[PDB]
Amino acid sequence: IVEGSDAEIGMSPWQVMLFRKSPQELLCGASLISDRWVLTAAHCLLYPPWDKNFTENDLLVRIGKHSRTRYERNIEKISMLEKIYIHPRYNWRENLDRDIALMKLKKPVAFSDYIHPVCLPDRETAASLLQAGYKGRVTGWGNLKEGQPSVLQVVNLPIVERPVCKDSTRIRITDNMFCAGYKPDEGKRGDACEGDSGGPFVMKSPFNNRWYQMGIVSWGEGCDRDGKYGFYTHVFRLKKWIQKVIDQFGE
C-alpha cells in the first residue's frame, strides 16, 4: 500500500496472507469468505509470463495477522490448501479479465477477535455502493513505494468514473473491473502496490453496517502514479462463478 497508514488491531479480520512455503515469502493478499474458503486474484496463483503456476502444496494461508514478518503466536492461524480453483475464463494473456480464484482450506479455521469472514455483495448492495465517488478500503502487506511495511497497511480510495478509468490506460477495461484512486488535483493520494494483489477492496454498507468485499486487488500501472488508478476485480459480477464452485465443492 502506497501512502496508507498502519491497520488497527482487528480492523480487517478477513485479511489473509498468501505465503510461499519455500522460500518463505509473501506472495499476495487474500480474504476469508467463510471458515473453509479464501478468495484471491487468479494472477497470484497463475501468471505464465512470470513462470508462475502454483499447486496447493506450494502455498500456505496465514489468517489473523497484523505484523508482516513475525510469527504471531496465539493470534494468527496458518492453513494448508485442499484445492485451488481459477476462473476458467481468467484472461492472463490480455488484460487480467476475471482475475479471481478460490482456495478451499484443508480444515475449518476457528474465528476469533482477529479472524472473521467478510460478506460478498448481492445485486442490490453492488448497485447501491459501486458508484463513482464512493470510497472503499484496501489493505495489504505490499510495498510502501513503487521499502516494506512492518504491519498491515490500510488506504481508503474513491471509486472512479468508468470513462476516466479507461482514459488513464491503453489496456482494454472490461465490466469485470472497476478502478479506484484519487485524481491529480485532489491532494489526497494512495494505491495498492506489489504484494497487495489478491487482497480485498471492501465497503461498509450504510444500511446493515456490514463489510462487503466489492473488489479484489488486480493490477495497476506502477503504484500511486498521478493520472493512473488501481484496477480491481468486480466481485459481484463473478458471483455466479463463486457460487458454482462453492455449491459443488463445499461441504
Binding site: 505465503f19 512455503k21 519455500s22 518463505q24 515469502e25 509473501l26 500456505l60 496465514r62 508482516r68 514478518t69 513475525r70 510469527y71 496458518i78 494448508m80
Partner: peptide
C-alpha cells in the same frame, strides 16, 4: 526476512 513458522505447517 520472515520469522520461521512452526515446522508442523510444512
Amino acid at each position: 526476512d520472515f520469522e520461521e513458522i512452526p515446522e508442523e505447517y510444512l
